[PDB]
Amino acid sequence: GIRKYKPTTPGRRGASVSDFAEITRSTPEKSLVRPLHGKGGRNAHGRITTRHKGGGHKRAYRVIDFRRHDKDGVNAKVAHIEYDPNRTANIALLHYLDGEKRYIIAPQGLKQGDVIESGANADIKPGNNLPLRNIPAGTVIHAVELRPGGGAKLARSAGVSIQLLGKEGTYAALRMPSGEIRRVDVRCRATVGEVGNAEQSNINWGKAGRMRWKGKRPTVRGVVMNPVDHPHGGGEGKTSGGRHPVSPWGKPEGRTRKPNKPSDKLIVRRRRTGK
RNA sequence: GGUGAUGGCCUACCAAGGCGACGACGGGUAGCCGGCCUGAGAGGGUGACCGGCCACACUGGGACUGAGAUACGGCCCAGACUCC
RNA sequence: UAAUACGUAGGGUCCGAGCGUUGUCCGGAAUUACUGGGCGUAAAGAGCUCGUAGGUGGUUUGUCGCGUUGUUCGUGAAAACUCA
RNA sequence: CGCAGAUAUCAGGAGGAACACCGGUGGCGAAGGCGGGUCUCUGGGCAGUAACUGACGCUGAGGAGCGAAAGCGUGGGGAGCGAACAGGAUUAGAUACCCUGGUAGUCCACGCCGUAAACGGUGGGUACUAGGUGUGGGUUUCCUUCCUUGGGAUCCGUGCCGUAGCUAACGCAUUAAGUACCCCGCCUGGGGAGUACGGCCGCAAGGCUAAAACUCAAAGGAAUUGACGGGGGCCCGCACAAGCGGCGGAGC
RNA sequence: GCGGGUAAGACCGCGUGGAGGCCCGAACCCACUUAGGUUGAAGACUGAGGGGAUGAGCUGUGGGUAGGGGUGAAAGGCCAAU
RNA sequence: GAGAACCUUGCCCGCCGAAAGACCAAGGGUUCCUGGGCCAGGCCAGUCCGCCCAGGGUGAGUCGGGACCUAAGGCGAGGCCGACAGGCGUAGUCGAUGGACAACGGGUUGAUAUUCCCGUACCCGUGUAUGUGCGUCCAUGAUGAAUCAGCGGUACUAACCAUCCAAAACCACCGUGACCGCACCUUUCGGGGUGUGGCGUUGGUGGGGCUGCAUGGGACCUUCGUUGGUAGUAGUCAAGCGAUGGGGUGACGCAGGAAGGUAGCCGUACCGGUCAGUGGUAAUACCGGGGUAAGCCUGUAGGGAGUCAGAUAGGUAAAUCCGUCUGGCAUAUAUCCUGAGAGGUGAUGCAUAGCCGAGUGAGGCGAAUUCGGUGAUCCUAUGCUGCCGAGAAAAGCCUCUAGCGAGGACAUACACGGCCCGUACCCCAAACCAACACAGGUGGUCAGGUAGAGAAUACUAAGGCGUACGAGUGAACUAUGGUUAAGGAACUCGGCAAAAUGCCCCCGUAACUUCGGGAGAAGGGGGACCCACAUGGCGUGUAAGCCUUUACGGCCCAAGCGUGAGUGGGUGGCACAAACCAGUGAGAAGCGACUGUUUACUAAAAACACAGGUCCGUGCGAAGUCGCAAGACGAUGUAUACGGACUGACGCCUGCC
RNA sequence: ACUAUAACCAUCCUAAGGUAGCGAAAUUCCUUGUCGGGUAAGUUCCGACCUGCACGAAUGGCGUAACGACUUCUCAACUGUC
RNA sequence: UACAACUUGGUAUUGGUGCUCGAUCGUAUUGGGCCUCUAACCUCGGACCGUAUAUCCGGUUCAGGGACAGUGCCUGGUGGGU
Ligand SMILES: [Mg+2]
Ligand SMILES: [Mg+2]
Ligand SMILES: [Mg+2]
Ligand SMILES: [Mg+2]
Ligand SMILES: [Mg+2]
Ligand SMILES: [Mg+2]
Ligand SMILES: [Mg+2]
Ligand SMILES: [Mg+2]
Ligand SMILES: [Mg+2]
Ligand SMILES: [Mg+2]
Ligand SMILES: [Mg+2]
Ligand SMILES: [Mg+2]
Ligand SMILES: [Mg+2]
Ligand SMILES: [Mg+2]
Ligand SMILES: [Mg+2]
Ligand SMILES: [Mg+2]
Ligand SMILES: [Mg+2]
Ligand SMILES: [Mg+2]
Ligand SMILES: [Mg+2]
Ligand SMILES: [Mg+2]
Ligand SMILES: [Mg+2]
Ligand SMILES: [Mg+2]
Ligand SMILES: [Mg+2]
Ligand SMILES: [Mg+2]
Ligand SMILES: [Mg+2]
Ligand SMILES: [Mg+2]
Ligand SMILES: [Mg+2]
Ligand SMILES: [Mg+2]
Ligand SMILES: [Mg+2]
Ligand SMILES: [Mg+2]
Ligand SMILES: [Mg+2]
Ligand SMILES: [Mg+2]
Ligand SMILES: [Mg+2]
Ligand SMILES: [Mg+2]
Ligand SMILES: [Mg+2]
Ligand SMILES: [Mg+2]
Ligand SMILES: [Mg+2]
Ligand SMILES: [Mg+2]
Ligand SMILES: [Mg+2]
Ligand SMILES: [Mg+2]
Ligand SMILES: [Mg+2]
Ligand SMILES: [Mg+2]
Ligand SMILES: [Mg+2]
Ligand SMILES: [Mg+2]
Ligand SMILES: [Mg+2]
Ligand SMILES: [Mg+2]
Ligand SMILES: [Mg+2]
Ligand SMILES: [Mg+2]
Ligand SMILES: [Mg+2]
Ligand SMILES: [Mg+2]
Ligand SMILES: [Mg+2]
Ligand SMILES: [Mg+2]
Ligand SMILES: [Mg+2]
Ligand SMILES: [Mg+2]
Ligand SMILES: [Mg+2]
Ligand SMILES: [Mg+2]
Ligand SMILES: [Mg+2]
Ligand SMILES: [Mg+2]
Ligand SMILES: [Mg+2]
Ligand SMILES: [Mg+2]
Ligand SMILES: [Mg+2]
Ligand SMILES: [Mg+2]
Ligand SMILES: [Mg+2]
Ligand SMILES: [Mg+2]
Ligand SMILES: [Mg+2]
Ligand SMILES: [Mg+2]
Ligand SMILES: [Mg+2]
Ligand SMILES: [Mg+2]
Ligand SMILES: [Mg+2]
Ligand SMILES: [Mg+2]
Ligand SMILES: [Mg+2]
Ligand SMILES: [Mg+2]
Ligand SMILES: [Mg+2]
Ligand SMILES: [Mg+2]
Ligand SMILES: [Mg+2]
Ligand SMILES: [Mg+2]
Ligand SMILES: [Mg+2]
Ligand SMILES: [Mg+2]
Ligand SMILES: [Mg+2]
Ligand SMILES: [Mg+2]
Ligand SMILES: [Mg+2]
Ligand SMILES: [Mg+2]
Ligand SMILES: [Mg+2]
Ligand SMILES: [Mg+2]
Ligand SMILES: [Mg+2]
Ligand SMILES: [Mg+2]
Ligand SMILES: [Mg+2]
Ligand SMILES: [Mg+2]
Ligand SMILES: [Mg+2]
Ligand SMILES: [Mg+2]
Ligand SMILES: [Mg+2]
Ligand SMILES: [Mg+2]
Ligand SMILES: [Mg+2]
Ligand SMILES: [Mg+2]
Ligand SMILES: [Mg+2]
Ligand SMILES: [Mg+2]
Ligand SMILES: [Mg+2]
Ligand SMILES: [Mg+2]
Ligand SMILES: [Mg+2]
Ligand SMILES: [Mg+2]
Ligand SMILES: [Mg+2]
Ligand SMILES: [Mg+2]
Ligand SMILES: [Mg+2]
Ligand SMILES: [Mg+2]
Ligand SMILES: [Mg+2]
Ligand SMILES: [Mg+2]
Ligand SMILES: [Mg+2]
Ligand SMILES: [Mg+2]
Ligand SMILES: [Mg+2]
Ligand SMILES: [Mg+2]
Ligand SMILES: [Mg+2]
Ligand SMILES: [Mg+2]
Ligand SMILES: [Mg+2]
Ligand SMILES: [Mg+2]
Ligand SMILES: [Mg+2]
Ligand SMILES: [Mg+2]
Ligand SMILES: [Mg+2]
Ligand SMILES: [Mg+2]
Ligand SMILES: [Mg+2]
Ligand SMILES: [Mg+2]
Ligand SMILES: [Mg+2]
Ligand SMILES: [Mg+2]
Ligand SMILES: [Mg+2]
Ligand SMILES: [Mg+2]
Ligand SMILES: [Mg+2]
Ligand SMILES: [Mg+2]
Ligand SMILES: [Mg+2]
Ligand SMILES: [Mg+2]
Ligand SMILES: [Mg+2]
Ligand SMILES: [Mg+2]
Ligand SMILES: [Mg+2]
Ligand SMILES: [Mg+2]
Ligand SMILES: [Mg+2]
Ligand SMILES: [Mg+2]
Ligand SMILES: [Mg+2]
Ligand SMILES: [Mg+2]
Ligand SMILES: [Mg+2]
Ligand SMILES: [Mg+2]
Ligand SMILES: [Mg+2]
Ligand SMILES: [Mg+2]
Ligand SMILES: [Mg+2]
Ligand SMILES: [Mg+2]
Ligand SMILES: [Mg+2]
Ligand SMILES: [Mg+2]
Ligand SMILES: [Mg+2]
Ligand SMILES: [Mg+2]
Ligand SMILES: [Mg+2]
Ligand SMILES: [Mg+2]
Ligand SMILES: [Mg+2]
Ligand SMILES: [Mg+2]
Ligand SMILES: [Mg+2]
Ligand SMILES: [Mg+2]
Ligand SMILES: [Mg+2]
Ligand SMILES: [Mg+2]
Ligand SMILES: [Mg+2]
Ligand SMILES: [Mg+2]
Ligand SMILES: [Mg+2]
Ligand SMILES: [Mg+2]
Ligand SMILES: [Mg+2]
Ligand SMILES: [Mg+2]
Ligand SMILES: [Mg+2]
Ligand SMILES: [Mg+2]
Ligand SMILES: [Mg+2]
Ligand SMILES: [Mg+2]
Ligand SMILES: [Mg+2]
Ligand SMILES: [Mg+2]
Ligand SMILES: [Mg+2]
Ligand SMILES: [Mg+2]
Ligand SMILES: [Mg+2]
Ligand SMILES: [Mg+2]
Ligand SMILES: [Mg+2]
Ligand SMILES: [Mg+2]
């Protein structure tokens, strides 16, 4: 749920968080951790590519099985549903009857002690992965893939996941959280059930310190920049920039997608706003 | 310890209680009563005189005298008033 | 414009060594409804429930009689009211 | 809104709200109110056996829970409808009635707010008091075909009309305003004003508790007859319609 | 956790717990006021005071970002007193 | 010494003493010591110097940098891309500020020291050969698996009992695509409507048998209940070391609390000395000491975790290892791991205050070497609890196996064997960075006593300094300060500055409010010393005592030590938080929510920034970036995410075009 | 309906012609606007009126507890600032 | 006045069939539009190999796309980003 904090000090009056009362562990499975580090928003050159990002609290990366096909026909137990900061959602560790422990995303309403099976024969209960040949139309799924074994790439959205629509030939149409419908091949794999932490968006940062914690640096407003460094820069006082807003590099709002994409044909329609 | 006489009347130490919605404590009003006016009555109002009590003595306090002091024209101090 | 309602006259009415005005208080005021109110619309049943305290109890079998009336002497000052 | 191919019309797809007929002066719920179905958990009410407890009863200041719609927060949803808002129109004037559209809201989840002509304008519970006409619910019992709103009786809820009574009257009339009992809310002429100040609640809009001054000598209720009605039924007139001829032009 | 309280609550008193860009205040980091200095002790200080002071903190360490570019909690600041 | 404030020695005085002392790193590189001289340098002289001139001085298997491993990142064979140059990045190899392996105390010269000497230890590397003692070249154990003869009432194939449905329309009615018409109505006759008759149906079954196929029953020939000889006759080795491979291990945040110890201190005892120009102390009292390591033993407080057998293909192959599942044994202070600290040895040693002869000062002798109590920011701790913002890698080590194999494993007497380079000095400073012997900056370690909360502050030890111009003069005037009659902001733009309050404990504290605050709001009272309560509460805890899974064990703890607080009585003083140190307060309002950041070197705000929202873009080899390219960021993220822009907590709102 | 008003209608034109809130304010030039509070005296301040030259609702409006080496003003102590 | 970037078409990396539309209702005009397919091309899907270790890369197989896309050259737009 949500616990609103009590306004002891001024910088802590609006800070409301979600209670992680469900976790069971306090130190991640060490056989499945790799080194990571705040990249600082810099490419091979070292020149900053994306602003606002860099610094913050160091984090430890863990490899988690979005490839969930390497094991089929072998069940696993939901060992412990632990928390990784690196990702929005929650990762739950599974014990396989084989003897592997692999990390995966924790779907909504999943609790320790349930059973997990991964294959074309699995049941339809939430938390099971299986190519879309074997999944009824209309169900709600997540952690979807974009081709037969390229690794799930879409709908990791903590709190939202895709909706299957209809199978024709070798493609399936998906209603998906951006409000868009995508034709995609049906040989991919997916899992049934909404993702967990549906209340994550309820967090109120409330304190610049924690924003820094999560890592992003401050944003320097437009009309305050100097005119040399940015189109709206300048103006003794507050002046709109005398022109329609524009990105710091001279391109204003409006369409940006490069159509003609290999997936341009695969897309059905385009997202709607204010409809 | 104190009082003509028991008692937080006063003192010390113990326990945290006592009073409170069958109206505490707070605020405005006003001497109480036998009585006076009214009303068939219950009741309402009210406290002129007389009378039974209370409290007061230029305003605030305190104490002596003795069987008996709120001691009106008894005492002391402080303020006001008037005067030598 | 033609007053039994203004003023003047007469005449009359009530009262009277007092006659009016004013003001306080009771009455009719059952107009704070105990005696002795009402709640549909005239003013009023809260929006409807459970239920603490309080208020109230479906029967007879049994005592103490503290609610009660029962009587006897035993208090109720004087003054005021009622009788002669 | 259409000649960029509208409407219509046919195939397919999407998606949200709501379930006609059953469906009524009917069920239930204490009250708001509640009905397309299926399953899941579950509340309340009634009939016969009357087995058992045995004065446990009633209702309730404060308190606390429930409580239509509108409104507010958070995040989803958002077909239709639709405050506000634009235009078109009538009108002297229309910031409306009407038309085109159309954002809040309307729906979901959790919190809120607690007011309605929240009406049966009637607090709850018990006992008694002539009937007539129906529904639904459950029981029995007999003409007995034992088919059968065939007949009898019973108790619960539910519509209308009616005696006596009561009532200001309209009206109620055993599901009372009757005749009593027990408890609780409430009112004392109309404005002022359910508002100002205050206390409490609410994040708010505001809600709850609840004043005085000054002014008026009436405001209100049911009912009687008029009058009138861009309210209804039945009637009549160069009233209308069909015809001629006319005045409003000129002089007189 | 216990005692009140619910029917479960919720709520409250009591003790424990010690969160906090919480408070006062040294090191450290800053630069608000005044004074002196302004051919100074100093190409920016000294002294009195002055704010934060468990954090968006500070600091050693070594690395990358090169000029019309970097960087820039944005002042036309910094990028070796420029 | 020619000269002497400035140097050497001595006496006193002052100053720092979380440094103005002592160690290092970075840095500098002879500034270290000794000897000689004083032109030049030192803001003066100068015998002195961080001057110059000569000589001397730096001693390591155990400290540090390479032999080791790695982060950020750099380089980069091939490779990809690029007009050239080059830019990328794989395998790899570099890259400390990290991880890994071993040292203590005393003594020593004018300079070095965990390096030299003394005494006592250690851990790594090679080898010895014997004592344990183990095979391959004998052979015993557990099993284990690649081979010939069939079965799952389930149920291939003609049927039976029972259940709902109808393909080749019989019987009956009815509506009538359309045809034949019987009576009436209608425009004068026509069309047409109504009622009915015969079919036909705009809307083709029932009855019965032959045959063939479809749905279950037993059985016929081929499919078993793994052996009957054989072939424990023969090919296999594990020892011992075996990886560019696998697994554990190493291996990790902030904050908080408490307990146990030490460094270290205080008093006691013990030891040695003590007679102080002065009243009184010749020991009751004073001065000084009272230390002692690593390693090797012990393994406590304490922290974490339970023991055997079978099978499982999962960890790129295989595994006795690690994970998993089954049973057996276990909840035993059982077992294992970790582990500061304490006791013993280390140590009959050393050092030691001082005694003696000997002076630029060395040398021999050498007493006591206990206790308690306080107590850390140091250690247990990389631990425990709790939070979200969820807190490196690799190596070494242990262990498991892939490729071998007729000689390794384990200890020890043994004398052997361990590099090179740094090592002097300075190192909050006249030695580094500032052009200087400059009031500046510079990271880590050590942290005494009395007061105090203290790492502030005041005075002091250890130890080092008075940092290089002096002497003399009551003037202005400037600067640093102290005091001031009365008035108290009247100056002045401004109460600028100055003055002022200032601690602890108690009482009581408004408006307002986001119910936290406001609030230390304001305001007030006590505070010194002595005595008593008291030989007080508290902690600590000895002897003794008690108990026992008997030990570094549990109960009491007289004794002893340390000990806040308060109440009463008394007393001195102007004053009792007297020093240093140590909030001015309140009222009304403007702007900004605040913590915060910024114009180094004139502006710290109302600017910036943010936490809140809004709009838009962004379908994942994403949007947008850097890059004439590969490619990298975005992100090892996925619309509850990311980018861009605007406003800026929160509440009411955010109108019209 | 005494007195100054527009609170109603007609004009043009553009798309409309500033709603709530506040308002001589950080915006108000006349201007020291006018009035009242504070002072003996107040061109600053506070509180109102609205004739807003030239406010105004995300280059956000209005209030807002707390915060501030922020702005203005007043008061008691305080003092050689005078 | 240009240019970076973004965007169009033709042309090339370029293949085939079926349909439907034209100027010398039964005789003729070669290209446009669509549906397919693999084979050019892409693939940041998979799985092998170089390899004893290689997420780069190269080759092989398959899988998805597929004559699109990308890329050049000409060209038109937009173009204070320079
Ligand atoms: Mg907040
Ligand atoms: Mg952990
Ligand atoms: Mg990782
Ligand atoms: Mg570069
Ligand atoms: Mg950004
Ligand atoms: Mg950092
Ligand atoms: Mg998360
Ligand atoms: Mg979408
Ligand atoms: Mg911005
Ligand atoms: Mg700026
Ligand atoms: Mg720049
Ligand atoms: Mg520009
Ligand atoms: Mg500007
Ligand atoms: Mg401007
Ligand atoms: Mg734009
Ligand atoms: Mg007695
Ligand atoms: Mg008493
Ligand atoms: Mg006593
Ligand atoms: Mg009196
Ligand atoms: Mg009486
Ligand atoms: Mg009476
Ligand atoms: Mg009476
Ligand atoms: Mg009386
Ligand atoms: Mg008398
Ligand atoms: Mg009297
Ligand atoms: Mg008496
Ligand atoms: Mg008196
Ligand atoms: Mg007297
Ligand atoms: Mg008298
Ligand atoms: Mg007298
Ligand atoms: Mg007259
Ligand atoms: Mg008269
Ligand atoms: Mg008369
Ligand atoms: Mg009267
Ligand atoms: Mg009454
Ligand atoms: Mg009424
Ligand atoms: Mg009512
Ligand atoms: Mg109400
Ligand atoms: Mg009696
Ligand atoms: Mg008697
Ligand atoms: Mg009597
Ligand atoms: Mg008498
Ligand atoms: Mg009488
Ligand atoms: Mg249609
Ligand atoms: Mg019975
Ligand atoms: Mg009751
Ligand atoms: Mg009751
Ligand atoms: Mg009540
Ligand atoms: Mg009550
Ligand atoms: Mg409730
Ligand atoms: Mg409730
Ligand atoms: Mg509604
Ligand atoms: Mg609603
Ligand atoms: Mg609203
Ligand atoms: Mg809401
Ligand atoms: Mg919404
Ligand atoms: Mg919708
Ligand atoms: Mg409408
Ligand atoms: Mg309109
Ligand atoms: Mg509409
Ligand atoms: Mg109401
Ligand atoms: Mg209703
Ligand atoms: Mg009711
Ligand atoms: Mg009743
Ligand atoms: Mg009736
Ligand atoms: Mg009657
Ligand atoms: Mg009734
Ligand atoms: Mg009645
Ligand atoms: Mg009244
Ligand atoms: Mg009212
Ligand atoms: Mg109130
Ligand atoms: Mg109210
Ligand atoms: Mg009426
Ligand atoms: Mg009538
Ligand atoms: Mg006519
Ligand atoms: Mg005429
Ligand atoms: Mg005429
Ligand atoms: Mg605490
Ligand atoms: Mg702070
Ligand atoms: Mg302070
Ligand atoms: Mg000087
Ligand atoms: Mg300089
Ligand atoms: Mg300073
Ligand atoms: Mg000062
Ligand atoms: Mg400070
Ligand atoms: Mg401060
Ligand atoms: Mg901070
Ligand atoms: Mg360079
Ligand atoms: Mg430039
Ligand atoms: Mg600027
Ligand atoms: Mg500028
Ligand atoms: Mg510079
Ligand atoms: Mg000399
Ligand atoms: Mg000092
Ligand atoms: Mg210090
Ligand atoms: Mg010190
Ligand atoms: Mg250095
Ligand atoms: Mg060096
Ligand atoms: Mg020297
Ligand atoms: Mg010399
Ligand atoms: Mg010389
Ligand atoms: Mg010289
Ligand atoms: Mg020399
Ligand atoms: Mg190469
Ligand atoms: Mg490279
Ligand atoms: Mg590389
Ligand atoms: Mg290396
Ligand atoms: Mg290194
Ligand atoms: Mg040395
Ligand atoms: Mg040494
Ligand atoms: Mg920690
Ligand atoms: Mg401790
Ligand atoms: Mg002496
Ligand atoms: Mg000693
Ligand atoms: Mg395994
Ligand atoms: Mg060796
Ligand atoms: Mg060397
Ligand atoms: Mg040295
Ligand atoms: Mg040195
Ligand atoms: Mg030094
Ligand atoms: Mg120099
Ligand atoms: Mg110097
Ligand atoms: Mg210096
Ligand atoms: Mg420093
Ligand atoms: Mg310290
Ligand atoms: Mg000193
Ligand atoms: Mg010293
Ligand atoms: Mg001077
Ligand atoms: Mg002076
Ligand atoms: Mg003085
Ligand atoms: Mg003065
Ligand atoms: Mg000042
Ligand atoms: Mg305050
Ligand atoms: Mg406060
Ligand atoms: Mg205070
Ligand atoms: Mg003991
Ligand atoms: Mg014992
Ligand atoms: Mg025991
Ligand atoms: Mg004194
Ligand atoms: Mg403001
Ligand atoms: Mg500020
Ligand atoms: Mg600040
Ligand atoms: Mg800032
Ligand atoms: Mg700044
Ligand atoms: Mg500066
Ligand atoms: Mg500056
Ligand atoms: Mg400044
Ligand atoms: Mg900001
Ligand atoms: Mg917003
Ligand atoms: Mg925005
Ligand atoms: Mg937006
Ligand atoms: Mg892209
Ligand atoms: Mg702003
Ligand atoms: Mg103003
Ligand atoms: Mg303002
Ligand atoms: Mg202004
Ligand atoms: Mg002005
Ligand atoms: Mg003015
Ligand atoms: Mg002034
Ligand atoms: Mg204006
Ligand atoms: Mg303007
Ligand atoms: Mg707007
Ligand atoms: Mg705006
Ligand atoms: Mg703007
Ligand atoms: Mg604003
Ligand atoms: Mg406010
Ligand atoms: Mg003043
Ligand atoms: Mg003075
Ligand atoms: Mg072309
Ligand atoms: Mg082509
Ligand atoms: Mg241009
Ligand atoms: Mg230009």
Counting DSSP H helices and E strands in chain A, the numbers are: 1, 12
Q: Contacts of strand H, CB cut-off 7 Å?
A: A 146-151, 170-171, 185, 187, 231, 246, 249-250, 258, 260, 262, 265
Shortest-distance nucleotide from A194 CA to C1': F640
The tokens describing A184, both together, are 């995609």
Distances (CA, A) of A202 to A17, A146, A162: 7, 30, 21
| Residue A91 φ then ψ, to 5° | -110, 130
| Tokens 């920049």 belong to residue | A225
Which one-letter DSSP state was computed for residue A123? -
Q: For residue A253, how many other CB atoms are within 10 A of its CB?
A: 9
* Strand G contacted by A239 CB (< 7 A): yes
Interatomic CA distance for residues A250 and A40, integer angstroms: 24
Distance from residue A161's CA to the centre of ligand 50 (Å): 37
Length of chain A: 275
3-state secondary structure of A18: strand
Reported resolution, Å = 2.5
C-alpha distance from residue A138 to each of A27, A167, A168 (Å): 39, 10, 14
How far, in Å, CA of A195 to CA of A140, rounded? 10
Structural biology method used: cryo-EM
Q: Within 10 Å of residue A229's Cβ, how many Cβ atoms?
A: 10
Rounded-to-integer distance, Cα A87 and Cα A208, Å? 21
* Residue where the block lists tokens 């005398």: A242
- Which residue places its CA closest to the C1' of nucleotide D79? A275
Distance between CA A141 and CA A187 in Å, rounded? 15
A53 touches strand E (CB under 7 A): no
Backbone dihedral angles phi then psi of residue A201, each to the nearest 5 degrees? -65, -10
Q: Which helix (H) or strand (E) holds A180?
A: strand A180-185
